[PDB]
Coordinates of C-alpha atoms and ligand atoms in Angstrom, one line a residue:
X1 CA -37.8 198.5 66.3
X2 CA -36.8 199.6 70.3
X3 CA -34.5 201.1 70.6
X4 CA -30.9 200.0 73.2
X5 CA -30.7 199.8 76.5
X6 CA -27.9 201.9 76.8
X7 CA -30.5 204.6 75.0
X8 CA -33.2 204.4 77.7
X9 CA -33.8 205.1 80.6
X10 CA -31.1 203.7 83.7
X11 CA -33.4 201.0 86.1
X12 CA -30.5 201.5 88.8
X13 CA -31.7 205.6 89.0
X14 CA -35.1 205.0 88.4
X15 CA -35.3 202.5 91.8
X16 CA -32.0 204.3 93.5
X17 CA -34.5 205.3 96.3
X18 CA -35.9 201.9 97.0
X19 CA -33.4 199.4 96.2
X20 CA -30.4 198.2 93.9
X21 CA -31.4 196.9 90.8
X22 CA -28.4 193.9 89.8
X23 CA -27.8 191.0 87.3
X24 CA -26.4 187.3 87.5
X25 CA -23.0 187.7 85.3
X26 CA -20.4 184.9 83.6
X27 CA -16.9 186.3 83.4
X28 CA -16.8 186.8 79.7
X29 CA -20.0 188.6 79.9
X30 CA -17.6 192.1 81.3
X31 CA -17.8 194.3 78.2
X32 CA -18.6 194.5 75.0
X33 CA -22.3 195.1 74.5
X34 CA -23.1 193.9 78.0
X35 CA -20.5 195.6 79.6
X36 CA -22.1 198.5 78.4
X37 CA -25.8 197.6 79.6
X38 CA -23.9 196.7 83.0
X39 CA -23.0 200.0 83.8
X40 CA -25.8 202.0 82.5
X41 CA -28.6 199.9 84.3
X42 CA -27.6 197.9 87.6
X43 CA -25.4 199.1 90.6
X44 CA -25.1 195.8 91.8
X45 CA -24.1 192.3 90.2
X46 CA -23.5 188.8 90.8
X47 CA -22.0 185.6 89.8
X48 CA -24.2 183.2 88.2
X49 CA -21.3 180.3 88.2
X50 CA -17.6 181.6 89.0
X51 CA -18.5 181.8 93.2
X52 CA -20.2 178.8 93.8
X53 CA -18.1 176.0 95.7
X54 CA -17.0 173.8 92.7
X55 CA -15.9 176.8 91.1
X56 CA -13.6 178.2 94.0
X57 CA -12.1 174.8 95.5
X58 CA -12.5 172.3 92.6
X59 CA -9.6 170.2 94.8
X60 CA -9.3 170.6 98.6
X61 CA -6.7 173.3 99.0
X62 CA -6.7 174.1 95.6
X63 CA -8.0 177.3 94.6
X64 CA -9.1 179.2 91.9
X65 CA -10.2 183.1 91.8
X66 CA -9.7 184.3 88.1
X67 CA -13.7 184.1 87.1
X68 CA -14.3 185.4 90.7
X69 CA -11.6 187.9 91.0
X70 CA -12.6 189.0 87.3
X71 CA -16.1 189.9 88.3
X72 CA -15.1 191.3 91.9
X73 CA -12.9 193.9 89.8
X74 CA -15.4 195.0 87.4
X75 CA -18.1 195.9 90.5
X76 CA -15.0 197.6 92.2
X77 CA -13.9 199.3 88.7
X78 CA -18.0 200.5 88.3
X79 CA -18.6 201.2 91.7
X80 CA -21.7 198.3 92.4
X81 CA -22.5 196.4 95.4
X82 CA -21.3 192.9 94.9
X83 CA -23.7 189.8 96.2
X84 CA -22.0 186.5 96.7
X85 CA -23.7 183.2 95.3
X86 CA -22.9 181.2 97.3
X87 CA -20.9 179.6 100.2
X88 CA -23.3 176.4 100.8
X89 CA -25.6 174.7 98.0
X90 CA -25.9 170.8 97.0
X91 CA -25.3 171.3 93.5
X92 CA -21.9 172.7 91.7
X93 CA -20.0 171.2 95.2
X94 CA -17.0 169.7 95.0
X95 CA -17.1 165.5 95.6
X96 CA -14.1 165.7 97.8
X97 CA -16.0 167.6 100.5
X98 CA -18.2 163.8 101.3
X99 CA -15.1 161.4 101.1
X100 CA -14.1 160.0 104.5
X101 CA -10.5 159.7 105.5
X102 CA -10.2 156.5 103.8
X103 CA -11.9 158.2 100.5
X104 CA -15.3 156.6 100.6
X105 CA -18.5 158.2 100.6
X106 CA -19.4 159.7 104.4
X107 CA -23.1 158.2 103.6
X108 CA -22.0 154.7 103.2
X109 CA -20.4 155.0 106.7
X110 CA -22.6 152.7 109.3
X111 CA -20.5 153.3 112.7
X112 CA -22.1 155.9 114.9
X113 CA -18.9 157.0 116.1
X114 CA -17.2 156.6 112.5
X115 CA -20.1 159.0 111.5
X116 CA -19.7 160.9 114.6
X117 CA -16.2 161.6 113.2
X118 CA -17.3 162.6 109.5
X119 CA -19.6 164.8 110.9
X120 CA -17.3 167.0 112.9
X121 CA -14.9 166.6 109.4
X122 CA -17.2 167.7 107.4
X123 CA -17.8 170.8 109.4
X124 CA -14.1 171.6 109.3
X125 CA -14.0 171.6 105.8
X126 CA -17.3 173.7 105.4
X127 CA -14.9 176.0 108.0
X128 CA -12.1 176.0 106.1
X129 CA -14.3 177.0 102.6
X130 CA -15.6 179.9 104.0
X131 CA -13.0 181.1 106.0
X132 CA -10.1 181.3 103.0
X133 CA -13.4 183.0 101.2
X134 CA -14.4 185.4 103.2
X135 CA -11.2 186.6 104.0
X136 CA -10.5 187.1 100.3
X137 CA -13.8 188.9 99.5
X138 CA -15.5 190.7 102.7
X139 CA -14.3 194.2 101.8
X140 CA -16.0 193.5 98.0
X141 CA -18.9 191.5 98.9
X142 CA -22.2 193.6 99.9
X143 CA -24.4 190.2 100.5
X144 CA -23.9 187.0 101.2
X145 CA -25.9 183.8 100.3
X146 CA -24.6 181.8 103.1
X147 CA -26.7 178.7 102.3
X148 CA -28.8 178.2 99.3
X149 CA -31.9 175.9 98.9
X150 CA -31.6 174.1 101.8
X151 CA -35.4 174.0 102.4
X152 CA -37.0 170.9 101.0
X153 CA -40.0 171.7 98.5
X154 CA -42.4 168.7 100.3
X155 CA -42.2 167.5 103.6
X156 CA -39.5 164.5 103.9
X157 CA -39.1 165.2 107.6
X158 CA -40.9 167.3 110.0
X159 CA -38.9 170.4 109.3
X160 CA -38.7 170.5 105.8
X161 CA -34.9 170.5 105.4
X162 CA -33.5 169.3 102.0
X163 CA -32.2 166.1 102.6
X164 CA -29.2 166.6 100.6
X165 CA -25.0 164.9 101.7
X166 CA -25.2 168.2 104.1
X167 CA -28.3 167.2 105.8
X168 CA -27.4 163.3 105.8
X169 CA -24.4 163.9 107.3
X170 CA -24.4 167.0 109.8
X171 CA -28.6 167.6 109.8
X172 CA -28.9 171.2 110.2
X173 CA -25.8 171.8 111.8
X174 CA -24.1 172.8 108.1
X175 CA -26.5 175.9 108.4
X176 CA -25.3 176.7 111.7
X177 CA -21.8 176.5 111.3
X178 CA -22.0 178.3 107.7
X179 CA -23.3 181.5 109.0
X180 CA -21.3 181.7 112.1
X181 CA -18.2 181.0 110.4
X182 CA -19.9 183.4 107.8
X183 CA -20.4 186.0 110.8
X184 CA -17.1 185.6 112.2
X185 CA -15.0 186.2 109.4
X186 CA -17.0 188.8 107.5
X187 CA -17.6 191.0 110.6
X188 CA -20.7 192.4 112.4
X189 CA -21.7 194.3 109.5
X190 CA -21.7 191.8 107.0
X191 CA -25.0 191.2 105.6
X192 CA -26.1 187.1 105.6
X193 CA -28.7 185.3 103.9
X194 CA -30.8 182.3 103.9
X195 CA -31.2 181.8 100.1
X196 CA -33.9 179.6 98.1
X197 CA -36.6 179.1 95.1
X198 CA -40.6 178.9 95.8
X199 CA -40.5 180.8 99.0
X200 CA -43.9 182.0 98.0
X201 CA -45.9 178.9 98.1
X202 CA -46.8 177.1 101.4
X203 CA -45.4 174.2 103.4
X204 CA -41.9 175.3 101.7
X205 CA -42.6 179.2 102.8
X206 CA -43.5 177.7 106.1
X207 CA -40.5 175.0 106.1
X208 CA -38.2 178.5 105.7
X209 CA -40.1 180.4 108.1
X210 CA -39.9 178.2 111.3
X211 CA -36.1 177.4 110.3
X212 CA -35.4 181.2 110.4
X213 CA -36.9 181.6 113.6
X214 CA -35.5 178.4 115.6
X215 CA -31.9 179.3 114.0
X216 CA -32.5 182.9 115.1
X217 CA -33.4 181.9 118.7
X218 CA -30.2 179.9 118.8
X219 CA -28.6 183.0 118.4
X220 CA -27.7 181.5 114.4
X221 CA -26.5 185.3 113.1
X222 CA -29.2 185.5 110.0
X223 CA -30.0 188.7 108.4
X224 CA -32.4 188.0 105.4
X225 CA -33.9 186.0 103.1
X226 CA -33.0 185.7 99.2
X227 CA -36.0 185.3 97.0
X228 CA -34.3 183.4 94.3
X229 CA -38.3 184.6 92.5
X230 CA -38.0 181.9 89.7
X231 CA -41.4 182.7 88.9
X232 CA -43.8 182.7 86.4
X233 CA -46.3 185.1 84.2
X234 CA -49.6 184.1 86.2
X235 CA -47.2 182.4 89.2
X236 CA -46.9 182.8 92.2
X237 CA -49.7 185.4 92.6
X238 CA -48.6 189.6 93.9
X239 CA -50.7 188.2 97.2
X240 CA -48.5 185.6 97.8
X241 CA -45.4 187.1 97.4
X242 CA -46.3 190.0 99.1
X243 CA -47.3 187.8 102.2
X244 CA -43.9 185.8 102.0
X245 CA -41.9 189.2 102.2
X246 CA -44.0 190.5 105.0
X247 CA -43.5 187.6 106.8
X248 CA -40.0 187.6 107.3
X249 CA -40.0 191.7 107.5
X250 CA -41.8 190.9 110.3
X251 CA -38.9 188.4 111.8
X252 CA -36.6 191.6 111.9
X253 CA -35.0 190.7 108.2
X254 CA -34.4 192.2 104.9
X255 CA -35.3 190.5 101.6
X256 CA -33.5 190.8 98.7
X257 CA -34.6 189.2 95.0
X258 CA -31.5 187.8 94.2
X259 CA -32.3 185.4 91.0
X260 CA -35.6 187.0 89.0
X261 CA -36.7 185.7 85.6
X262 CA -40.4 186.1 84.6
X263 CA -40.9 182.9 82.5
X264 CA -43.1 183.0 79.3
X265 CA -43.9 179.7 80.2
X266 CA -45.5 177.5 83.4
X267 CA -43.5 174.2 84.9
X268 CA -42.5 172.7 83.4
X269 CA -41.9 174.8 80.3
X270 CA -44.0 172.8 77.6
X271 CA -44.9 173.6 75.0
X272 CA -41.9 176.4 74.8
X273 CA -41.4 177.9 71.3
X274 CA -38.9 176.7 69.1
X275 CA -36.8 180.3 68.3
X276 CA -36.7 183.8 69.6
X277 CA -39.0 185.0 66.2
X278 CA -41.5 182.5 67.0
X279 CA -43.2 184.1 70.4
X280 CA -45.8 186.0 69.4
X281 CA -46.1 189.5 71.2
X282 CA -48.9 188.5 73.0
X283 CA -46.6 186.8 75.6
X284 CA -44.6 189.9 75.9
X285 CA -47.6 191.8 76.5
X286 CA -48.4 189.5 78.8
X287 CA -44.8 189.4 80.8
X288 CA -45.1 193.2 80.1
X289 CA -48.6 193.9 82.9
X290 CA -46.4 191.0 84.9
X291 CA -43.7 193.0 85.5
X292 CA -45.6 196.4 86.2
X293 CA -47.4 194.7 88.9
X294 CA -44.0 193.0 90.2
X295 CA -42.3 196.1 90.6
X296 CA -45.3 198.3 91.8
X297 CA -45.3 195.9 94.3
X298 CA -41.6 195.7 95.0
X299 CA -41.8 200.0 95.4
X300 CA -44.4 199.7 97.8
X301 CA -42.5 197.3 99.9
X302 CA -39.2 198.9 99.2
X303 CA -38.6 199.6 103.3
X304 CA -38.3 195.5 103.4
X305 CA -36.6 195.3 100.1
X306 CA -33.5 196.0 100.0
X307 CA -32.2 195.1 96.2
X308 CA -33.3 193.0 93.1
X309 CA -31.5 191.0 90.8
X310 CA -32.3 189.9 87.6
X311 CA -30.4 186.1 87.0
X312 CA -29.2 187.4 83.7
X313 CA -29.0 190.5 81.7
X314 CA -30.6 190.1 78.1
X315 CA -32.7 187.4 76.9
X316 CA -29.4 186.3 74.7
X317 CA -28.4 184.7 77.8
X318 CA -30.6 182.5 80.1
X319 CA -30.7 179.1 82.6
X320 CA -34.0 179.1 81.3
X321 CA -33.6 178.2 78.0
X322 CA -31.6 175.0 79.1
X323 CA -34.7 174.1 80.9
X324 CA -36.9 174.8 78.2
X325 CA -34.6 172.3 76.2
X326 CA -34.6 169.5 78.6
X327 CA -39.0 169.4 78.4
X328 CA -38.6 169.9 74.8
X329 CA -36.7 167.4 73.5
X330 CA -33.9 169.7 73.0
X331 CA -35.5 172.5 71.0
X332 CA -36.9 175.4 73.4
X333 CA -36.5 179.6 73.8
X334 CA -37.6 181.5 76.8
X335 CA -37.5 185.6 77.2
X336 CA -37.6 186.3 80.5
X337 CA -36.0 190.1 80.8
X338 CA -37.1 193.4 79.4
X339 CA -34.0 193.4 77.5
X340 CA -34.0 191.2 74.4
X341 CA -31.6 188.7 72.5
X342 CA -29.9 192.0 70.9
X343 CA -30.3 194.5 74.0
X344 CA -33.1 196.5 72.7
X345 CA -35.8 197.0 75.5
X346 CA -39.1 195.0 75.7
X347 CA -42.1 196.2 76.5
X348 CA -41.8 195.6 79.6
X349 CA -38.8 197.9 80.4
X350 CA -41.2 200.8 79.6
X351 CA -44.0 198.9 82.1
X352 CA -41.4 199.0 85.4
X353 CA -39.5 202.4 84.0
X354 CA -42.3 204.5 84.1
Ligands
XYS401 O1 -39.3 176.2 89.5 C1 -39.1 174.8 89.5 C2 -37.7 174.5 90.2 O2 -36.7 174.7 89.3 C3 -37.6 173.2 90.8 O3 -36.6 172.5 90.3 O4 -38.8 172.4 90.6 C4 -39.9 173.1 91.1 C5 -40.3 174.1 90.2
XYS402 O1 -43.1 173.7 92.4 C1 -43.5 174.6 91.4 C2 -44.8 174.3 90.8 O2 -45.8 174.2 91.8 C3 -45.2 175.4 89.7 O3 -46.4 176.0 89.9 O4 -44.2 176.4 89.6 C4 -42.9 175.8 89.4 C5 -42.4 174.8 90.3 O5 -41.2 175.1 90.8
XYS403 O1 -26.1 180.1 81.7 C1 -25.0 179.5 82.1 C2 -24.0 179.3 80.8 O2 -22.7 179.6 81.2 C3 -24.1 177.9 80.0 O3 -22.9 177.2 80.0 O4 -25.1 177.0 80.7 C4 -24.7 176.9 82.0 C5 -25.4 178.1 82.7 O5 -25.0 178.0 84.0
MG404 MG1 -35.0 199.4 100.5
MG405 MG1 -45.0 200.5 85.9

């Protein structure tokens, strides 16, 4: 029997000299048990759901802040830098944003000048988003995901861009506008990032790279890359992820892990185990050497590196286990912290404490 996480060892002081050490949290997730492990482990936090654009303008002009504002105040309250996922994604985006004037869908539209208009519409609205957003959050907010997955994961067109409404529509001209508007109203000193999943693995690593670097010669005000690091036991490999960081270190930009969950399984998840009490320790042993040789390397890259974030606290609560489900006909556990379903460290906290 381990014992609690708020009995061991704080990961925040253990990494203070390197970088921050944050979680993905829900709004109801602000005390009681986790409130606790909040506090004693990670000086930095973000939203895994309240922040994204859905969740802050559900209705054009009508705004809501409570899950947002809730989880601003707690990292003001505790004193932790405060990420923001995100101003630009594909998913958990409000319909309204692709209507045309006359309410149909800007894709449908065939008139080059008709689109022409949509376009420049769409942009304002992207504007408008960010703008009432920033201005509500730049003195809280310590990074911000200006755009997230917007990087294809084959090779639809030259470039690699998602082809998502965004792309359809404005082609990479969302990007551009999100991170100057981004720049504009957060101020010089606001840190901006270029968020995404599998930036470890080439063409996608590639896709991101060139992007980065023709946005950056535009004068497009990027400052780092997000690793969302949805990875794996045996996947991607220490090589590869060390190369991916080192290549953008060496565009001038910081990287940041913003959504780390070592997965007991590969992809897709099958065959997951049913419950909790049926994976055997072997696979924690397993995740345990994964994570020592994660964080050994994060240290010796920490002058690149400047925070990691877990997307979740304890393995009571995961996005993982949802996908486990959906490849296992609705029956699936993962365990993919060092903290487990009743916050008593893993194995692996003693692996990456140490
Ligand atoms: O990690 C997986 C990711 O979630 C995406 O959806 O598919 C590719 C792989
Ligand atoms: O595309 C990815 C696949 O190649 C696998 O290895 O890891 C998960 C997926 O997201
Ligand atoms: O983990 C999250 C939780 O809130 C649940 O409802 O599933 C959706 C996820 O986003
Ligand atoms: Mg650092
Ligand atoms: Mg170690």
């Amino acid at each position: 029997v381990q014992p609690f996480a708020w009995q061991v060892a704080s990961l925040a002081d253990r990494y203070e000299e390197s970088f921050d050490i944050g979680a993905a949290v829900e709004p109801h997730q602000l005390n009681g048990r986790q409130g606790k492990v909040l506090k004693h482990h990670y000086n930095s936090i973000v939203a895994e759901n309240a922040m994204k654009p859905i969740s802050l303008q559900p209705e054009e002009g009508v705004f809501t802040w409570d899950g947002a504002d809730a989880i601003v105040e707690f990292a003001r309250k505790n004193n932790m830098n405060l990420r923001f996922h995100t101003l630009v994604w594909h998913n958990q985006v409000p319909d309204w944003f692709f209507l045309d004037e006359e309410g149909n869908p800007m894709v449908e539209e065939t008139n080059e000048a008709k689109r022409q208009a949509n376009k420049e519409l769409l942009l304002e609205r992207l504007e408008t988003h960010i703008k009432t957003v920033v201005e509500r959050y730049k003195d809280d907010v310590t990074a911000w995901d200006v755009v997230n997955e917007v990087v294809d994961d084959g090779t639809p067109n030259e470039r690699g861009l998602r082809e998502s409404v965004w792309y359809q529509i404005t082609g990479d001209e969302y990007i551009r506008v999100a991170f100057e508007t981004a720049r504009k109203y957060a101020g010089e000193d606001a840190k901006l990032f270029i968020n995404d999943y599998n930036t470890e693995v080439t063409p996608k690593r590639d896709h991101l790279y060139n992007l980065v670097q023709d946005l950056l010669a535009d004068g497009v005000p990027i400052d780092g890359v997000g690793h969302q690091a949805h990875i794996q036991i045996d996947w991607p490999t220490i090589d590869e992820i060390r190369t991916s960081m080192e290549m953008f270190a060496g565009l001038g930009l910081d990287n940041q892990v913003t959504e780390l969950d070592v997965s007991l399984y590969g992809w897709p998840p099958r065959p997951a185990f049913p419950t909790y009490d049926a994976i055997p320790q072997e696979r924690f042993q397993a995740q345990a050497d994964r994570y020592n040789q994660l964080f050994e390397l994060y240290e010796e890259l920490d002058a690149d590196l400047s925070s990691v974030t877990f997307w979740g606290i304890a393995d009571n609560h995961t996005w993982l286990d949802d996908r486990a489900r959906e490849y296992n006909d609705g029956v699936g556990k993962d365990a993919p912290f060092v903290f487990d379903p009743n916050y008593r460290v893993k194995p692996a906290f003693w692996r990456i404490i140490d």
